[PDB]
Design a protein around this ligand. Sequence first.
Ligand code: NA
Lengths: 136, 533, 136, 76
Amino acid sequence: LAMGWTNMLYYTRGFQQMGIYAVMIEKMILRDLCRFMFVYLVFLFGFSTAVVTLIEDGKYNSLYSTCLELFKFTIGMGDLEFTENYDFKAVFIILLLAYVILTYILLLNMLIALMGETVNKIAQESKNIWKLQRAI
Amino acid sequence: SYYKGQTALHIAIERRNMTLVTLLVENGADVQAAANGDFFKKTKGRPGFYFGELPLSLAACTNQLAIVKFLLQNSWQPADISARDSVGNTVLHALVEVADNTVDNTKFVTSMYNEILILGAKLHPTLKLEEITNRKGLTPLALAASSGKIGVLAYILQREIHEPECRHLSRKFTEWAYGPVHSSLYDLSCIDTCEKNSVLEVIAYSSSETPNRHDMLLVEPLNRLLQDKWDRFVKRIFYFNFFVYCLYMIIFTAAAYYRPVEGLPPYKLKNTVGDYFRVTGEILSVSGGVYFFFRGIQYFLQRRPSLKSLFVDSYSEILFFVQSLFMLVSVVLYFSQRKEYVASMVFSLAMGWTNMLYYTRGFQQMGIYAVMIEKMILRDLCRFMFVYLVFLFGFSTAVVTLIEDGKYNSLYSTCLELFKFTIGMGDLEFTENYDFKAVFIILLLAYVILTYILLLNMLIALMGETVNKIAQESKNIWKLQRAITILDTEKSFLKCMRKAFRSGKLLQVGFTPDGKDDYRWCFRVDEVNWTTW
Amino acid sequence: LAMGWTNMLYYTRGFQQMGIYAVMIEKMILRDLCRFMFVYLVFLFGFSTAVVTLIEDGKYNSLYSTCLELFKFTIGMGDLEFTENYDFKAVFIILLLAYVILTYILLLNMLIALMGETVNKIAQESKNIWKLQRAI
Amino acid sequence: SYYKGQTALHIAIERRNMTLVTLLVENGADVQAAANGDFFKKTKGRPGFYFGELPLSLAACTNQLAIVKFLLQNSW
Ligand code: NA
């Protein structure tokens, strides 16, 4: 049901502006997800493994829970004080701050690189691709 | 009906055979024949070459100069100039129509126009052609303005003739010169108030489909004229209006914020200053609402615009009208013993407070900013909200189907819970009454990723169109808005006074071909020229 | 104390890159705050007055509290369910959603307009201004 | 007060008539006359062509090279 509801973007073709917008979405999904998700996943897994190793025992002592807790920092609702069963608070704080800084730099560079290729050579291609799709 | 009405004279004219044309003319056939074939109609079928329907107009518009000279300089039977076809177009009107805003076409059209004008003036100096109008009451200048012919209007407004006995045909002059500084003049007749339709009135009120509305008000005299009128009185009038509106809105909000809460209005006043003040505030607010209602209805009645031009244009009259309607509905409910008047009044209050962006025009930077906001709202909301709503509804339906029973088992609650993820306060663990936790987590993560990609692409696409072609358009649109404001304020005479006036009386040409002199309401402009001495 | 601590940006001049950065900050503060704060304040006051009028009686029945509650929506921690002492829930929700949409559009347009003027004619001016400051 | 202070020498200088300028010079009239008209003031009214208020400055600023040569190289 969810896939079918989201799969109605195919009918925008035939409406010029909407067709161009859908083509842009398709191109971005096909050409940037693989290139931009590998690095983020590597960072997340590394820091999640480190933090899970540090903790001694409790509710957040598994891997899935800590992975989720570190993922929450990207939708802007991280906690920074989500556990207290451990030692060497300095290590914990340092790790969390380093992860936050690195991921924000990564997203900023993602955005700038994505914008760079658009030197105004993005509409002349999208329009042509949309015309080809309408032709088929 | 297609090729009917054609005559051999038209062929002779359009074959470029001077000798054959002369021989055919010598036969004695009439030279005022008109062709009524549908091929010569305005837009009855994509094929068609409209030329004014007369042979003289064929010569005028078909590169024919020596031919038209021969036709108009032949003692046998010279072709009349003032002839008007079925639509009423004259040779000048046909020339204006044939223009298509191209450099070669524009130079050709202006050259031919000048030649025909000088020839006609020389042959019949008594008659003036620029005052002859077709059925629709459009002069050649007005017709050029209406159709957005930039080149013809530019040439006509500053037409200069440097030949004896033809100076009076020109509009731009040179009163005096000294060193590198010399002062020019411009004729304002038929620019500000022609008593039928001015250039400013026609250009300002023209609907948006006209090609070059924005880029037409850059011609020399018009810009200075608008700036002068503004600085003369529109600044003061506009500031006074701004102050009055702000005072009224402060009164309205203060009166409404203190509404009594007892139940089932109307409420009986008490013998205290507070109640009298509140009653006065309510009366003032209602009076303002009804006044705006009449103003809006009057404007809509007078202009009578189209349906697709009611959002591209009149974007503020609609909002003021809507606010007035909300206030009127609120008072009607208030006097009907109900409790919805609170909702109606608060809607009106919020809309009115946010509807004060209209007064930024008059402040350059703020006006440009407001214009940018308006353009974005009008041109991206519809294109960028449909996709987001589709995604949200799809995933909300999926998640609501998954859950078994509880507080979040409806549709509105889950829609809100998924919307919270976009203002950056989503939960990801907001319920626990279900099965297959993997499905739940997968759905939520997919929704988050898709919506973030969507917003990123929204931003990049929005930025792309701004390749630095966004200020040159915003500035022009703001100038047009200020121009319409100036025209409106001038039209609505302040109180019973009347002092607005174009410029000062003056004598420039000395004498017409007739003995009497003449006056033409000049508007002097001072310029400094250093090179090209 | 706070003003003095933040007033040490004046000593960056003498370090080229930092001097340019400080000059950019100064120019932006002087040339965009007044032009970009008036509209936001107008919107905030209008919707705050509307919402405060709607509510009947309680803790959020004043003006300062509701102004703060609506301001919280811009640092990304708004609530959307912060009170329940009123009638016509549809009106409340509609007002809050309209405010959020309008303010996000406003910030987006703020950013795009700010970027537009930088058509790469921003370094040649900043460098010259920094040189003038060093000269003085 | 507007065109006051003007003298025929200024016209002769600003008409580019070398022969007429020479003939007028030969008359013996003073060549240090100053025009105090408001037309020659700095910014008293948008019209105005400030030139230093002396004929030599008129020659200097009005493309006049041979004329200034003649003025400065005349034994009269
Ligand atoms: Na947050």
